[PDB]
Point group: T
Chain length 21, copies 12
């Protein structure tokens, strides 16, 4: 599958996360 990357800033901290589809 494809893994997109986004900075999840919804949490207090910002963190790079993968988004797998």
């Amino acid at each position: 599958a494809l893994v997109f990357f986004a900075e999840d800033c919804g949490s207090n901290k910002c963190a790079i996360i993968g988004l797998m589809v």
Copy 2:
């Protein structure tokens, strides 16, 4: 415009946000 609603969740808490198109 269209307004979609989503919970913006973090490491612990979440908040209702609008997503406008």
Copy 3:
């Protein structure tokens, strides 16, 4: 099917609408 929830806004007045799939 899935029914997504959205608000159709315009002229400072919104209305709940469904979006079906």
Copy 4:
């Protein structure tokens, strides 16, 4: 992550569900 919501309907049975991204 973001949590969207949808009404998942089958055979006259519907239940709100989350969809996490």
Copy 5:
């Protein structure tokens, strides 16, 4: 238009459906 396909499952009952755009 384009016609996508999905398996719509409810309570152990699934049926292929079209989704037209």
Copy 6:
């Protein structure tokens, strides 16, 4: 950014709007 165009038909009027990404 890409500027898509859509007709936003609210309640009192429609209007060609931009939607930039």
Copy 7:
């Protein structure tokens, strides 16, 4: 709702169509 416009060339002829969401 929003009405997007696309040239539907899937048909032999190409034609502007609306896509309502």
Copy 8:
């Protein structure tokens, strides 16, 4: 890459096409 399938329909006929991401 991911390959989605759709019927590319016209005024009369349709054809299976791939949509690659």
Copy 9:
């Protein structure tokens, strides 16, 4: 939920996969 159909391809070899919603 909806189950979308896709092929995961790579190195000249694809495999059917589901994508659930």
Copy 10:
């Protein structure tokens, strides 16, 4: 396939482009 249209901007040198699906 469907052909959407967008204004592709770059340092404010926008122009109409097609986006095929």
Copy 11:
């Protein structure tokens, strides 16, 4: 919110930008 990243090109003057959701 989530922040995706893309290379926004214009006459081949690409640069990284954020795309917030």
Copy 12:
């Protein structure tokens, strides 16, 4: 056009690919 990036994990290997819109 915007160039998004994703990790395309097939069967023999992953690889950072582009996906331009």
